[PDB]
Structure 1
């Protein structure tokens, strides 16, 4: 048997449709970008909860994630990342 495997490939392809509607993706490229988000997710979350443990505070929260991303990303990308995280969570909380 073979269990259903987690993937973000549909979302990756959709955002590529938004960017370049005429462009497709190779299978190897799609596996590569599917691995991108999981690798980033891990190296953000571990650092964020380690920072939370340094705070000796129970909850991993938005401030912890913001700090973790701005720690680990190179600064030029970090500015964009924190701005987009903040505006996204604000748009959500405005619901």
Structure 2
């Protein structure tokens, strides 16, 4: 009858943009794009699940930047966790300033 087919959400445009920002000469196949889409979704679900567990342990019905920073330091290892925390702090500082 009608068209109106469901639209599947994906991060293919953001991964390709990061690729062009890092290596503006390489390409990403469809399988690699699907792998990166499953990796981003799995990490996002693991961090959101860790932040929800922290918000449920401490009697507080909110999720601020501290809950995400703690979930990052608990999931990521050493240097990666510190770099991600520094990037997040720089981002929130640029947001609170600009």
Q: Pick the TM interval, shorter chain.
A: over 0.9
CA distance in 1, matches of 2:9, 2:97: 30
Q: Report the 3-state secondary structure (helix = DSSP H, G, I; strand = E; otherwise coil) of the residue aligned with 1:79.
A: helix
Aligned residue in 2 for 1:54? 57
Which residue of the other structure, out of 80, 87, 90, is the alignment partner of 1:84?
87
Aligned residue in 1 for 2:23? 20
CA distance in 2, matches of 1:2, 1:74: 42
TM-score by length of 1: 0.93
Instruction: Compute the displacement of 1:2 (Å).
Output: 4.2
Moved over 6 A (4+): none
TM-score by length of 2: 0.91
Gaps of 5+ in 1: none
Q: Report the aligned-residue RMSD.
A: 1.2
Larger radius of gyration: 2
